PDB file of N, CA and C in Angstrom:
ATOM      1  N   UNK A   1     -15.130   2.767   2.353  1.00 28.84           N
ATOM      2  CA  UNK A   1     -14.633   4.003   1.647  1.00 28.84           C
ATOM      3  C   UNK A   1     -13.315   3.782   0.884  1.00 28.84           C
ATOM      4  N   UNK A   2     -12.152   4.073   1.503  1.00 32.14           N
ATOM      5  CA  UNK A   2     -10.864   3.862   0.830  1.00 32.14           C
ATOM      6  C   UNK A   2     -10.382   2.438   1.030  1.00 32.14           C
ATOM      7  N   UNK A   3     -10.192   1.732  -0.081  1.00 33.33           N
ATOM      8  CA  UNK A   3      -9.685   0.347  -0.058  1.00 33.33           C
ATOM      9  C   UNK A   3      -8.196   0.351  -0.394  1.00 33.33           C
ATOM     10  N   UNK A   4      -7.419  -0.219   0.509  1.00 30.79           N
ATOM     11  CA  UNK A   4      -5.972  -0.292   0.292  1.00 30.79           C
ATOM     12  C   UNK A   4      -5.456  -1.743   0.307  1.00 30.79           C
ATOM     13  N   UNK A   5      -4.630  -2.067  -0.689  1.00 30.26           N
ATOM     14  CA  UNK A   5      -4.038  -3.395  -0.786  1.00 30.26           C
ATOM     15  C   UNK A   5      -2.563  -3.271  -0.556  1.00 30.26           C
ATOM     16  N   UNK A   6      -2.037  -4.049   0.399  1.00 31.99           N
ATOM     17  CA  UNK A   6      -0.579  -4.208   0.562  1.00 31.99           C
ATOM     18  C   UNK A   6      -0.150  -5.520  -0.162  1.00 31.99           C
ATOM     19  N   UNK A   7       0.665  -5.412  -1.221  1.00 31.11           N
ATOM     20  CA  UNK A   7       1.055  -6.591  -2.024  1.00 31.11           C
ATOM     21  C   UNK A   7       2.525  -6.815  -1.753  1.00 31.11           C
ATOM     22  N   UNK A   8       2.846  -7.933  -1.091  1.00 32.14           N
ATOM     23  CA  UNK A   8       4.217  -8.228  -0.681  1.00 32.14           C
ATOM     24  C   UNK A   8       4.365  -9.711  -0.359  1.00 32.14           C
ATOM     25  N   UNK A   9       5.611 -10.184  -0.345  1.00 30.94           N
ATOM     26  CA  UNK A   9       5.883 -11.607  -0.168  1.00 30.94           C
ATOM     27  C   UNK A   9       6.257 -11.934   1.259  1.00 30.94           C
ATOM     28  N   UNK A  10       6.150 -10.947   2.137  1.00 32.15           N
ATOM     29  CA  UNK A  10       6.409 -11.155   3.562  1.00 32.15           C
ATOM     30  C   UNK A  10       5.486 -12.183   4.224  1.00 32.15           C
ATOM     31  N   UNK A  11       5.930 -12.709   5.357  1.00 36.64           N
ATOM     32  CA  UNK A  11       5.112 -13.598   6.166  1.00 36.64           C
ATOM     33  C   UNK A  11       3.914 -12.904   6.786  1.00 36.64           C
ATOM     34  N   UNK A  12       3.086 -13.689   7.441  1.00 35.72           N
ATOM     35  CA  UNK A  12       1.774 -13.246   7.944  1.00 35.72           C
ATOM     36  C   UNK A  12       1.847 -12.069   8.955  1.00 35.72           C
ATOM     37  N   UNK A  13       2.745 -12.169   9.930  1.00 32.52           N
ATOM     38  CA  UNK A  13       2.896 -11.141  10.962  1.00 32.52           C
ATOM     39  C   UNK A  13       3.408  -9.865  10.350  1.00 32.52           C
ATOM     40  N   UNK A  14       4.526  -9.945   9.617  1.00 32.07           N
ATOM     41  CA  UNK A  14       5.007  -8.794   8.858  1.00 32.07           C
ATOM     42  C   UNK A  14       3.954  -8.129   7.959  1.00 32.07           C
ATOM     43  N   UNK A  15       3.196  -8.927   7.170  1.00 35.61           N
ATOM     44  CA  UNK A  15       2.121  -8.384   6.307  1.00 35.61           C
ATOM     45  C   UNK A  15       1.091  -7.560   7.097  1.00 35.61           C
ATOM     46  N   UNK A  16       0.740  -8.021   8.297  1.00 32.55           N
ATOM     47  CA  UNK A  16      -0.251  -7.326   9.140  1.00 32.55           C
ATOM     48  C   UNK A  16       0.333  -6.031   9.639  1.00 32.55           C
ATOM     49  N   UNK A  17       1.640  -6.029   9.903  1.00 29.62           N
ATOM     50  CA  UNK A  17       2.331  -4.851  10.444  1.00 29.62           C
ATOM     51  C   UNK A  17       2.401  -3.754   9.360  1.00 29.62           C
ATOM     52  N   UNK A  18       2.781  -4.146   8.135  1.00 27.82           N
ATOM     53  CA  UNK A  18       2.766  -3.205   6.988  1.00 27.82           C
ATOM     54  C   UNK A  18       1.384  -2.592   6.757  1.00 27.82           C
ATOM     55  N   UNK A  19       0.336  -3.416   6.645  1.00 29.15           N
ATOM     56  CA  UNK A  19      -1.074  -2.906   6.542  1.00 29.15           C
ATOM     57  C   UNK A  19      -1.422  -1.891   7.640  1.00 29.15           C
ATOM     58  N   UNK A  20      -1.096  -2.248   8.881  1.00 29.35           N
ATOM     59  CA  UNK A  20      -1.338  -1.329   9.992  1.00 29.35           C
ATOM     60  C   UNK A  20      -0.600  -0.004   9.851  1.00 29.35           C
ATOM     61  N   UNK A  21       0.688  -0.049   9.469  1.00 28.05           N
ATOM     62  CA  UNK A  21       1.506   1.155   9.314  1.00 28.05           C
ATOM     63  C   UNK A  21       0.951   2.065   8.160  1.00 28.05           C
ATOM     64  N   UNK A  22       0.546   1.427   7.059  1.00 28.90           N
ATOM     65  CA  UNK A  22      -0.104   2.137   5.935  1.00 28.90           C
ATOM     66  C   UNK A  22      -1.387   2.825   6.421  1.00 28.90           C
ATOM     67  N   UNK A  23      -2.206   2.069   7.152  1.00 27.78           N
ATOM     68  CA  UNK A  23      -3.467   2.568   7.667  1.00 27.78           C
ATOM     69  C   UNK A  23      -3.261   3.785   8.578  1.00 27.78           C
ATOM     70  N   UNK A  24      -2.254   3.717   9.471  1.00 26.99           N
ATOM     71  CA  UNK A  24      -1.901   4.789  10.420  1.00 26.99           C
ATOM     72  C   UNK A  24      -1.526   6.042   9.665  1.00 26.99           C
ATOM     73  N   UNK A  25      -0.690   5.904   8.631  1.00 25.51           N
ATOM     74  CA  UNK A  25      -0.286   7.049   7.778  1.00 25.51           C
ATOM     75  C   UNK A  25      -1.499   7.694   7.049  1.00 25.51           C
ATOM     76  N   UNK A  26      -2.445   6.848   6.619  1.00 25.83           N
ATOM     77  CA  UNK A  26      -3.644   7.328   5.964  1.00 25.83           C
ATOM     78  C   UNK A  26      -4.497   8.135   6.949  1.00 25.83           C
ATOM     79  N   UNK A  27      -4.571   7.659   8.183  1.00 27.95           N
ATOM     80  CA  UNK A  27      -5.323   8.368   9.212  1.00 27.95           C
ATOM     81  C   UNK A  27      -4.676   9.690   9.581  1.00 27.95           C
ATOM     82  N   UNK A  28      -3.337   9.768   9.586  1.00 28.79           N
ATOM     83  CA  UNK A  28      -2.622  11.041   9.791  1.00 28.79           C
ATOM     84  C   UNK A  28      -2.991  12.087   8.714  1.00 28.79           C
ATOM     85  N   UNK A  29      -3.196  11.616   7.488  1.00 28.66           N
ATOM     86  CA  UNK A  29      -3.652  12.461   6.389  1.00 28.66           C
ATOM     87  C   UNK A  29      -5.158  12.839   6.465  1.00 28.66           C
ATOM     88  N   UNK A  30      -5.892  12.287   7.416  1.00 27.47           N
ATOM     89  CA  UNK A  30      -7.291  12.677   7.595  1.00 27.47           C
ATOM     90  C   UNK A  30      -8.287  11.739   6.944  1.00 27.47           C
ATOM     91  N   UNK A  31      -7.787  10.611   6.424  1.00 27.01           N
ATOM     92  CA  UNK A  31      -8.610   9.573   5.796  1.00 27.01           C
ATOM     93  C   UNK A  31      -9.183   8.668   6.880  1.00 27.01           C
ATOM     94  N   UNK A  32     -10.493   8.708   7.068  1.00 26.72           N
ATOM     95  CA  UNK A  32     -11.077   8.108   8.258  1.00 26.72           C
ATOM     96  C   UNK A  32     -11.566   6.685   8.076  1.00 26.72           C
ATOM     97  N   UNK A  33     -12.066   6.369   6.878  1.00 25.79           N
ATOM     98  CA  UNK A  33     -12.790   5.121   6.653  1.00 25.79           C
ATOM     99  C   UNK A  33     -11.977   4.231   5.668  1.00 25.79           C
ATOM    100  N   UNK A  34     -11.308   3.225   6.222  1.00 24.62           N
ATOM    101  CA  UNK A  34     -10.285   2.500   5.466  1.00 24.62           C
ATOM    102  C   UNK A  34     -10.561   0.999   5.586  1.00 24.62           C
ATOM    103  N   UNK A  35     -10.475   0.291   4.461  1.00 25.96           N
ATOM    104  CA  UNK A  35     -10.547  -1.176   4.377  1.00 25.96           C
ATOM    105  C   UNK A  35      -9.181  -1.610   3.851  1.00 25.96           C
ATOM    106  N   UNK A  36      -8.424  -2.363   4.636  1.00 27.20           N
ATOM    107  CA  UNK A  36      -7.051  -2.771   4.290  1.00 27.20           C
ATOM    108  C   UNK A  36      -6.968  -4.270   4.141  1.00 27.20           C
ATOM    109  N   UNK A  37      -6.300  -4.701   3.067  1.00 28.49           N
ATOM    110  CA  UNK A  37      -6.066  -6.098   2.779  1.00 28.49           C
ATOM    111  C   UNK A  37      -4.611  -6.302   2.341  1.00 28.49           C
ATOM    112  N   UNK A  38      -4.110  -7.528   2.465  1.00 28.63           N
ATOM    113  CA  UNK A  38      -2.792  -7.859   1.924  1.00 28.63           C
ATOM    114  C   UNK A  38      -2.816  -9.167   1.170  1.00 28.63           C
ATOM    115  N   UNK A  39      -1.882  -9.333   0.228  1.00 28.47           N
ATOM    116  CA  UNK A  39      -1.742 -10.600  -0.441  1.00 28.47           C
ATOM    117  C   UNK A  39      -0.364 -10.520  -1.123  1.00 28.47           C
ATOM    118  N   UNK A  40      -0.024 -11.538  -1.920  1.00 27.14           N
ATOM    119  CA  UNK A  40       1.291 -11.540  -2.553  1.00 27.14           C
ATOM    120  C   UNK A  40       1.286 -10.601  -3.760  1.00 27.14           C
ATOM    121  N   UNK A  41       2.474 -10.238  -4.254  1.00 26.81           N
ATOM    122  CA  UNK A  41       2.581  -9.466  -5.506  1.00 26.81           C
ATOM    123  C   UNK A  41       1.896 -10.209  -6.655  1.00 26.81           C
ATOM    124  N   UNK A  42       2.138 -11.509  -6.786  1.00 26.46           N
ATOM    125  CA  UNK A  42       1.484 -12.267  -7.886  1.00 26.46           C
ATOM    126  C   UNK A  42      -0.039 -12.327  -7.736  1.00 26.46           C
ATOM    127  N   UNK A  43      -0.515 -12.506  -6.521  1.00 24.09           N
ATOM    128  CA  UNK A  43      -1.974 -12.426  -6.261  1.00 24.09           C
ATOM    129  C   UNK A  43      -2.558 -11.022  -6.543  1.00 24.09           C
ATOM    130  N   UNK A  44      -1.797  -9.977  -6.260  1.00 27.38           N
ATOM    131  CA  UNK A  44      -2.291  -8.613  -6.459  1.00 27.38           C
ATOM    132  C   UNK A  44      -2.546  -8.280  -7.928  1.00 27.38           C
ATOM    133  N   UNK A  45      -1.845  -8.941  -8.853  1.00 28.29           N
ATOM    134  CA  UNK A  45      -2.098  -8.742 -10.277  1.00 28.29           C
ATOM    135  C   UNK A  45      -3.567  -8.855 -10.626  1.00 28.29           C
ATOM    136  N   UNK A  46      -4.221  -9.862 -10.088  1.00 28.80           N
ATOM    137  CA  UNK A  46      -5.646 -10.148 -10.338  1.00 28.80           C
ATOM    138  C   UNK A  46      -6.598  -9.354  -9.453  1.00 28.80           C
ATOM    139  N   UNK A  47      -6.103  -8.856  -8.310  1.00 29.44           N
ATOM    140  CA  UNK A  47      -6.986  -8.165  -7.346  1.00 29.44           C
ATOM    141  C   UNK A  47      -6.848  -6.654  -7.294  1.00 29.44           C
ATOM    142  N   UNK A  48      -5.696  -6.125  -7.722  1.00 30.02           N
ATOM    143  CA  UNK A  48      -5.374  -4.691  -7.596  1.00 30.02           C
ATOM    144  C   UNK A  48      -6.400  -3.726  -8.186  1.00 30.02           C
ATOM    145  N   UNK A  49      -7.123  -4.159  -9.206  1.00 29.67           N
ATOM    146  CA  UNK A  49      -8.156  -3.312  -9.802  1.00 29.67           C
ATOM    147  C   UNK A  49      -9.309  -3.004  -8.847  1.00 29.67           C
ATOM    148  N   UNK A  50      -9.435  -3.748  -7.754  1.00 30.10           N
ATOM    149  CA  UNK A  50     -10.526  -3.551  -6.794  1.00 30.10           C
ATOM    150  C   UNK A  50     -10.223  -2.449  -5.761  1.00 30.10           C
ATOM    151  N   UNK A  51      -8.985  -1.954  -5.771  1.00 29.74           N
ATOM    152  CA  UNK A  51      -8.465  -1.125  -4.691  1.00 29.74           C
ATOM    153  C   UNK A  51      -8.142   0.290  -5.136  1.00 29.74           C
ATOM    154  N   UNK A  52      -8.348   1.229  -4.225  1.00 29.19           N
ATOM    155  CA  UNK A  52      -8.033   2.648  -4.452  1.00 29.19           C
ATOM    156  C   UNK A  52      -6.539   2.919  -4.416  1.00 29.19           C
ATOM    157  N   UNK A  53      -5.864   2.218  -3.498  1.00 28.37           N
ATOM    158  CA  UNK A  53      -4.425   2.360  -3.263  1.00 28.37           C
ATOM    159  C   UNK A  53      -3.809   0.980  -3.199  1.00 28.37           C
ATOM    160  N   UNK A  54      -2.690   0.809  -3.896  1.00 31.15           N
ATOM    161  CA  UNK A  54      -1.957  -0.452  -3.873  1.00 31.15           C
ATOM    162  C   UNK A  54      -0.516  -0.114  -3.493  1.00 31.15           C
ATOM    163  N   UNK A  55      -0.048  -0.766  -2.439  1.00 34.95           N
ATOM    164  CA  UNK A  55       1.306  -0.536  -1.858  1.00 34.95           C
ATOM    165  C   UNK A  55       2.187  -1.771  -2.074  1.00 34.95           C
ATOM    166  N   UNK A  56       3.421  -1.584  -2.529  1.00 35.02           N
ATOM    167  CA  UNK A  56       4.305  -2.706  -2.781  1.00 35.02           C
ATOM    168  C   UNK A  56       5.751  -2.239  -2.750  1.00 35.02           C
ATOM    169  N   UNK A  57       6.686  -3.200  -2.710  1.00 32.66           N
ATOM    170  CA  UNK A  57       8.098  -2.895  -2.833  1.00 32.66           C
ATOM    171  C   UNK A  57       8.320  -2.119  -4.117  1.00 32.66           C
ATOM    172  N   UNK A  58       9.079  -1.024  -4.019  1.00 35.10           N
ATOM    173  CA  UNK A  58       9.551  -0.266  -5.197  1.00 35.10           C
ATOM    174  C   UNK A  58      10.238  -1.136  -6.249  1.00 35.10           C
ATOM    175  N   UNK A  59      10.899  -2.199  -5.795  1.00 35.44           N
ATOM    176  CA  UNK A  59      11.604  -3.143  -6.700  1.00 35.44           C
ATOM    177  C   UNK A  59      10.679  -4.030  -7.510  1.00 35.44           C
ATOM    178  N   UNK A  60       9.455  -4.164  -7.021  1.00 30.31           N
ATOM    179  CA  UNK A  60       8.474  -4.989  -7.676  1.00 30.31           C
ATOM    180  C   UNK A  60       7.238  -4.264  -8.229  1.00 30.31           C
ATOM    181  N   UNK A  61       7.112  -2.939  -8.125  1.00 32.85           N
ATOM    182  CA  UNK A  61       5.809  -2.327  -8.507  1.00 32.85           C
ATOM    183  C   UNK A  61       5.600  -2.417 -10.017  1.00 32.85           C
ATOM    184  N   UNK A  62       6.697  -2.492 -10.756  1.00 32.16           N
ATOM    185  CA  UNK A  62       6.620  -2.726 -12.199  1.00 32.16           C
ATOM    186  C   UNK A  62       5.786  -3.993 -12.508  1.00 32.16           C
ATOM    187  N   UNK A  63       5.699  -4.955 -11.586  1.00 29.44           N
ATOM    188  CA  UNK A  63       4.866  -6.151 -11.823  1.00 29.44           C
ATOM    189  C   UNK A  63       3.363  -5.778 -11.816  1.00 29.44           C
ATOM    190  N   UNK A  64       3.044  -4.610 -11.253  1.00 28.77           N
ATOM    191  CA  UNK A  64       1.631  -4.212 -10.986  1.00 28.77           C
ATOM    192  C   UNK A  64       1.161  -3.031 -11.850  1.00 28.77           C
ATOM    193  N   UNK A  65       2.102  -2.429 -12.557  1.00 29.11           N
ATOM    194  CA  UNK A  65       1.828  -1.351 -13.501  1.00 29.11           C
ATOM    195  C   UNK A  65       0.864  -1.887 -14.548  1.00 29.11           C
ATOM    196  N   UNK A  66      -0.205  -1.143 -14.774  1.00 28.44           N
ATOM    197  CA  UNK A  66      -1.286  -1.565 -15.630  1.00 28.44           C
ATOM    198  C   UNK A  66      -2.346  -2.486 -15.015  1.00 28.44           C
ATOM    199  N   UNK A  67      -2.173  -2.919 -13.753  1.00 27.46           N
ATOM    200  CA  UNK A  67      -3.119  -3.872 -13.144  1.00 27.46           C
ATOM    201  C   UNK A  67      -4.214  -3.161 -12.355  1.00 27.46           C
ATOM    202  N   UNK A  68      -4.020  -1.862 -12.147  1.00 27.85           N
ATOM    203  CA  UNK A  68      -4.985  -1.044 -11.424  1.00 27.85           C
ATOM    204  C   UNK A  68      -5.059   0.380 -11.978  1.00 27.85           C
ATOM    205  N   UNK A  69      -6.236   0.979 -11.848  1.00 26.15           N
ATOM    206  CA  UNK A  69      -6.413   2.412 -12.113  1.00 26.15           C
ATOM    207  C   UNK A  69      -6.213   3.262 -10.864  1.00 26.15           C
ATOM    208  N   UNK A  70      -5.942   2.612  -9.728  1.00 25.29           N
ATOM    209  CA  UNK A  70      -5.649   3.312  -8.480  1.00 25.29           C
ATOM    210  C   UNK A  70      -4.223   3.848  -8.330  1.00 25.29           C
ATOM    211  N   UNK A  71      -3.928   4.419  -7.155  1.00 24.51           N
ATOM    212  CA  UNK A  71      -2.586   4.895  -6.815  1.00 24.51           C
ATOM    213  C   UNK A  71      -1.671   3.752  -6.500  1.00 24.51           C
ATOM    214  N   UNK A  72      -0.610   3.581  -7.271  1.00 24.29           N
ATOM    215  CA  UNK A  72       0.353   2.501  -7.023  1.00 24.29           C
ATOM    216  C   UNK A  72       1.479   3.123  -6.230  1.00 24.29           C
ATOM    217  N   UNK A  73       1.708   2.693  -4.993  1.00 23.62           N
ATOM    218  CA  UNK A  73       2.734   3.312  -4.152  1.00 23.62           C
ATOM    219  C   UNK A  73       3.898   2.342  -3.874  1.00 23.62           C
ATOM    220  N   UNK A  74       5.111   2.724  -4.271  1.00 24.65           N
ATOM    221  CA  UNK A  74       6.306   1.913  -4.060  1.00 24.65           C
ATOM    222  C   UNK A  74       7.174   2.342  -2.890  1.00 24.65           C
ATOM    223  N   UNK A  75       7.620   1.372  -2.107  1.00 24.72           N
ATOM    224  CA  UNK A  75       8.469   1.628  -0.947  1.00 24.72           C
ATOM    225  C   UNK A  75       9.786   0.876  -1.044  1.00 24.72           C
ATOM    226  N   UNK A  76      10.903   1.566  -0.798  1.00 28.27           N
ATOM    227  CA  UNK A  76      12.219   0.890  -0.655  1.00 28.27           C
ATOM    228  C   UNK A  76      12.257   0.022   0.586  1.00 28.27           C
ATOM    229  N   UNK A  77      11.708   0.525   1.692  1.00 30.38           N
ATOM    230  CA  UNK A  77      11.488  -0.240   2.914  1.00 30.38           C
ATOM    231  C   UNK A  77      10.014  -0.172   3.356  1.00 30.38           C
ATOM    232  N   UNK A  78       9.342  -1.321   3.310  1.00 31.32           N
ATOM    233  CA  UNK A  78       7.916  -1.455   3.636  1.00 31.32           C
ATOM    234  C   UNK A  78       7.556  -1.233   5.116  1.00 31.32           C
ATOM    235  N   UNK A  79       8.549  -1.273   5.997  1.00 31.16           N
ATOM    236  CA  UNK A  79       8.307  -1.047   7.419  1.00 31.16           C
ATOM    237  C   UNK A  79       8.665   0.352   7.902  1.00 31.16           C
ATOM    238  N   UNK A  80       9.172   1.198   7.014  1.00 29.79           N
ATOM    239  CA  UNK A  80       9.644   2.520   7.378  1.00 29.79           C
ATOM    240  C   UNK A  80       8.474   3.527   7.372  1.00 29.79           C
ATOM    241  N   UNK A  81       7.947   3.823   8.566  1.00 31.08           N
ATOM    242  CA  UNK A  81       6.805   4.719   8.782  1.00 31.08           C
ATOM    243  C   UNK A  81       7.009   6.064   8.136  1.00 31.08           C
ATOM    244  N   UNK A  82       8.268   6.529   8.101  1.00 32.82           N
ATOM    245  CA  UNK A  82       8.549   7.833   7.505  1.00 32.82           C
ATOM    246  C   UNK A  82       8.494   7.843   5.981  1.00 32.82           C
ATOM    247  N   UNK A  83       9.040   6.804   5.331  1.00 33.23           N
ATOM    248  CA  UNK A  83       8.903   6.652   3.902  1.00 33.23           C
ATOM    249  C   UNK A  83       7.426   6.405   3.540  1.00 33.23           C
ATOM    250  N   UNK A  84       6.746   5.596   4.356  1.00 33.44           N
ATOM    251  CA  UNK A  84       5.327   5.287   4.144  1.00 33.44           C
ATOM    252  C   UNK A  84       4.554   6.636   4.059  1.00 33.44           C
ATOM    253  N   UNK A  85       4.699   7.471   5.093  1.00 36.52           N
ATOM    254  CA  UNK A  85       4.022   8.771   5.187  1.00 36.52           C
ATOM    255  C   UNK A  85       4.414   9.669   4.031  1.00 36.52           C
ATOM    256  N   UNK A  86       5.700   9.702   3.696  1.00 39.61           N
ATOM    257  CA  UNK A  86       6.178  10.543   2.598  1.00 39.61           C
ATOM    258  C   UNK A  86       5.575  10.124   1.268  1.00 39.61           C
ATOM    259  N   UNK A  87       5.623   8.826   0.953  1.00 38.67           N
ATOM    260  CA  UNK A  87       5.110   8.306  -0.335  1.00 38.67           C
ATOM    261  C   UNK A  87       3.592   8.449  -0.473  1.00 38.67           C
ATOM    262  N   UNK A  88       2.860   8.215   0.608  1.00 39.62           N
ATOM    263  CA  UNK A  88       1.412   8.493   0.602  1.00 39.62           C
ATOM    264  C   UNK A  88       1.129   9.979   0.422  1.00 39.62           C
ATOM    265  N   UNK A  89       1.818  10.853   1.169  1.00 35.03           N
ATOM    266  CA  UNK A  89       1.612  12.283   0.916  1.00 35.03           C
ATOM    267  C   UNK A  89       1.835  12.658  -0.531  1.00 35.03           C
ATOM    268  N   UNK A  90       2.916  12.126  -1.128  1.00 35.34           N
ATOM    269  CA  UNK A  90       3.315  12.457  -2.478  1.00 35.34           C
ATOM    270  C   UNK A  90       2.278  11.977  -3.468  1.00 35.34           C
ATOM    271  N   UNK A  91       1.679  10.819  -3.216  1.00 31.29           N
ATOM    272  CA  UNK A  91       0.609  10.286  -4.097  1.00 31.29           C
ATOM    273  C   UNK A  91      -0.750  10.964  -3.986  1.00 31.29           C
ATOM    274  N   UNK A  92      -1.120  11.352  -2.773  1.00 30.85           N
ATOM    275  CA  UNK A  92      -2.474  11.800  -2.494  1.00 30.85           C
ATOM    276  C   UNK A  92      -2.651  13.307  -2.269  1.00 30.85           C
ATOM    277  N   UNK A  93      -1.621  13.975  -1.761  1.00 30.00           N
ATOM    278  CA  UNK A  93      -1.720  15.405  -1.430  1.00 30.00           C
ATOM    279  C   UNK A  93      -1.547  16.243  -2.687  1.00 30.00           C
TER     280      UNK A  93
END
């Protein structure tokens, strides 16, 4: 159903934690069926068009503008559950 890409330069453990936190926020909004993936910002340029939602650092989302027709969501802090929830609400609600 909903495909979400986390595009960031973090290490493997951190990347999994961000995907999980994004997924949790989506489930709070009532989105039940979610496919989550992560890769680098440079890799996301070529892949972002496949995804409904693309999440990245606010400092880098300009690298992804025009690479997807989906919701591009920027975060000042990628681990902040409260900003995550706020930015997803703002994009989707």
